Amino acid sequence: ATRGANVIWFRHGLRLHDNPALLAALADKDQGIALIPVFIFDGESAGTKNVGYNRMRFLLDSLQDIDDQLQAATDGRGRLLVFEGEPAYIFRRLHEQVRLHRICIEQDCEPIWNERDESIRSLCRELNIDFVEKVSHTLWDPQLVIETNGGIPPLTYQMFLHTVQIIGLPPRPTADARLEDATFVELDPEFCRSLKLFEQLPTPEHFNVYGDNMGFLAKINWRGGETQALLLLDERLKVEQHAFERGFYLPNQALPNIHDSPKSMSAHLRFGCLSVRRFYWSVHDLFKNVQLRACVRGVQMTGGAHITGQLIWREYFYTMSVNNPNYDRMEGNDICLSIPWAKPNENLLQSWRLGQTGFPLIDGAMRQLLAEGWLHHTLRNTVATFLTRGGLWQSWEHGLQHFLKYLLDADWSVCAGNWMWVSSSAFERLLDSSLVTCPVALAKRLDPDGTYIKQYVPELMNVPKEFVHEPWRMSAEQQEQYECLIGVHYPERIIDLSMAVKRNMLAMKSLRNSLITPPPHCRPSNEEEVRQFFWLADLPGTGGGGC
Amino acid sequence: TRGANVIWFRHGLRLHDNPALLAALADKDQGIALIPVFIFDGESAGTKNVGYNRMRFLLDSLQDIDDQLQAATDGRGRLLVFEGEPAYIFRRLHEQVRLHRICIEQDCEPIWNERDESIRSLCRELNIDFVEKVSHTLWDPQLVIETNGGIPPLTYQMFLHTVQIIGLPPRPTADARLEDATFVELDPEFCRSLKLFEQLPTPEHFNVYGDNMGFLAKINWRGGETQALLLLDERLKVEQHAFERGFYLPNQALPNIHDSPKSMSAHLRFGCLSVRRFYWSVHDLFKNVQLRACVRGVQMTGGAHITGQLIWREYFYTMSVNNPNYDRMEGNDICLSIPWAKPNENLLQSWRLGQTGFPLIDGAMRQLLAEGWLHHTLRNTVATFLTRGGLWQSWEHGLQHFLKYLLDADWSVCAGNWMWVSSSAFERLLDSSLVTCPVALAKRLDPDGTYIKQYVPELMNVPKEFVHEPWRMSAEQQEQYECLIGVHYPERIIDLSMAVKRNMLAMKSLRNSLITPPPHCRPSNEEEVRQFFWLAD
Ligand SMILES: Cc1cc2nc3c(=O)[nH]c(=O)nc-3n(C[C@H](O)[C@H](O)[C@H](O)COP(=O)(O)OP(=O)(O)OC[C@H]3O[C@@H](n4cnc5c(N)ncnc54)[C@H](O)[C@@H]3O)c2cc1C
Ligand SMILES: Cc1cc2nc3c(=O)[nH]c(=O)nc-3n(C[C@H](O)[C@H](O)[C@H](O)COP(=O)(O)OP(=O)(O)OC[C@H]3O[C@@H](n4cnc5c(N)ncnc54)[C@H](O)[C@@H]3O)c2cc1C
Ligand SMILES: [Mg+2]
Ligand SMILES: [Mg+2]
Ligand SMILES: [Mg+2]
């Protein structure tokens, strides 16, 4: 704090590697400019506006990871300062203590962050402070791929692939930061109490966040932070290594597995614990210059396109929301079809949230969502269709707000886009087939021996495998013979699906004859894209049928 | 006149991409004439073990060349078709008009060695240039074998790795200009003494008649170069629709056994269509464009899902080069010696005639006798049922029957595919019932019974729910539709559940006896088996 100080404000991108904003904050070590790493609980940033217990713990685990790494490389001189209040109020009064030359941040391209960031930009113009903004949460610059497509984001996944190949490959991750020679600031102890500088790392209880509806089914647990994200990346980079030397995927690898352990990095990518560019260019360097022939779920393995294509799905949804604050709703949302959803049935909606629908796979997935906060992509498709076009004809907004609260990742743009991609695509009639919107048939495909169902629906523990997916088929004597009387211990089906899929298919067909014009909306590229999205494989598409 | 060059046709019955032909016209400005020659010596172009369908195909291609030679020369150019010994014909042809060069296309298969070396020792005597050019395969098989250390690659993945080192295959040559080419009209008595055909002969001239049934063949094929080019341009438009769509329709990815005469395997066997023209046409149509979809476990970028099929053809041609025992078990170093049962002429005849009691097996073998072409999934079914997945008979019996009635019937490809499927004892998926059961495959390929009812017409009155398993019908059902297990349709000539049971024991006993799996023709991995048999992958 001799000649001033630079601020690296953390919101997302809670990491030290591949942090251009951190490097720009460390670029004045020679001039004696100090470094101040800060995180502010302003009541919305890092997804704290609508958060449950599982994601708040994940965020606090990442803040501690940054805090422990700073001390491990600065002999204890480096400290992550966690505040709680208005960001513009904290930065102005902190400028009274030490001179702020540059305030470095990572670009949050989502429009819900525009108010927060433009107030800091307006503050720096008043105090003559450099406002440094770096793009590192996404692979490309969202404004660069939007202007390439003519000032509007691509609405289909293929239209996004066509534009990024024009721009080229995304930038490589930056080098690591050296903090052994960096100086920090010891400010006034009373100034810390006024601006609410935490002396200890807070807990979710400090923010009135306690155990959720189910508490916790401690079968799957996730430790946040940059250390665990890099530990899981190397674990997966070796699984791809074995499949790379093998040249093909084992049949058990290409199939969706819902009985596995916490290996997903979607929560580490949302908070920015793991760099998306480091994920991308680690797969690229491991696959380039080796031609392959086998595929993984209809996507080639040559060049790692089956892995890096997943990171483009995330980039494709992040950019569609940039200049659209109504992206989470349908009124005022220009790229979402207006579907006549039924009236809010909060009795059925509560049966969907609590996992009391009478359908085993739906209940087992929603109870895992409440307890553990993570669902497989196949299970997220099932509960989304069952709530919307597939089962109850409820608006996807009621499912988005529930997901954004209990999900570990819960990207405001990725989660909202996936709800519209699946529920509000009227001209993709393959989504109306019960062969893709039936949880009973899918239960036999993902959970053959009822291992997953009985693990998160414990009332079905003793029913034999011949009646797990269809408990209603048991006799009156058999129902009390396995401690499961449908309607008492296990709830009955809140709706008849076979008569519900008929109502919804005709109600959606009614929209198509009224809208012969297909307006620009978030939709699948083609029918082949639906089959890979819903992990169909053997019998999907036109002419595939039931073999 | 002064001299003449001979373009001798054996394979490569075409005018385009014919480097041997271009070498014959290379001395056009010297006053050296041209002599197109095809000799029925009793073995060339697969005429030693041939049926009526393939002989009809060969003669259709010879007429195409003769018709093309007249349209480009206003009647001056003709195709000379002889019948006799090639070295005797060429020697007496040399004293009528001096032969400077004898140009042929390379036949790398060892069954043609004694024929070519016979002509080779003749030209060194009479001081004639023996020009041999490679155009039947994508690469020179010697350059592929020598790159692999002097031995041919025994797995398909080992082959793709070797040709990747060599590089992309050569592109087809330019078309030949025959508008200013001179020919010779020989002495009429010389044409009488050398057995020169005036009219193109018929299959009946070679003691070849209309098979056993013959009339069930209404899906007929017409040989020739210009007609093979029509099939190439036809599929090129189908592939660009998928190229512009970005993916294959599900009905396209599924095998189709009730389709049209679409295949070009017979045209590529006789050389009516150039394989390099086939390769580089698909390569130019898919280049510079990145695709992400796949076709049955193989990518579509660069046309690898199409060009990879042509590499299967080269992979079997290259393996048989220095192995004259490639079509037999004894003395074949690349074939596992499997204890096959003693030859049973009753079950073998029921396999050929299609009287085994299994509907899909009967419909395929009866289609082979009439039309002489089967889908790859149907050739697999009748091959496993004859060998490891049924009767446990030697693959040598099925090879001779296939080399006789097939339209393609490449000596190296057909034998290689027979060993690849039958004698792969260490590929344990090959013995799974998903591959060794035609009943489940019948409901998978021909669901409603359309293909079975037309090639097994004794089952057309049987409804769909009993057409795949006619033995399951009751007493009044075998009479209401009149299909008794005995007089109308034969009983299953073997117990399939018991046969596959005892055959898997013999393969394990073979593996337990062979602690070393010696280098043999085998699949590369289990994934390669799924793609080969059109499985779920
Ligand atoms: C209703 C619904 C809501 C979803 N909400 C989210 C969300 O809030 N956050 C989120 O990251 N993903 C979301 N997804 C996508 C998908 O469910 C997860 O990305 C996936 O389950 C993560 O598992 P994984 O990393 O092991 O899969 P991988 O195949 O390893 O995915 C690699 C990465 O690619 C990205 N990705 C994968 N699939 C998609 C997709 N369909 N759309 C966008 N990005 C994708 C993620 O960042 C993911 O971590 C949602 C999908 C649905 C159907
Ligand atoms: C027991 C058995 C015997 C066979 N005998 C022959 C034969 O005598 N001649 C022959 O050309 N093919 C043979 N094959 C391969 C296969 O049956 C045919 O190549 C294929 O059915 C031709 O149909 P298509 O051209 O429409 O297929 P496509 O997929 O269009 O094939 C493209 C071309 O690639 C080549 N090709 C395709 N598959 C193979 C293969 N497995 N091995 C070698 N070349 C291949 C052929 O030249 C074919 O025309 C045999 C396969 C088996 C199982
Ligand atoms: Mg992951
Ligand atoms: Mg063909
Ligand atoms: Mg399968």
Residue numbers in the entry:
A (entry chain B): 2 to 548
B (entry chain A): 3 to 539
Paper text:
Cryptochromes (CRYs) serve as blue-light sensors in species that range from bacteria to vertebrates. In the fly Drosophila melanogaster, cryptochrome (dCRY) entrains the circadian clock to light. In type I insect CRYs the 23-residue CCE ends in a highly conserved 10-residue helical C-terminal tail (CTT) that inserts into the flavin binding pocket. The dark-state structure of dCRY shows that the CTT binds to the FAD pocket through a conserved FFW motif (F534, F535, and W536), which contributes to dCRY stability.
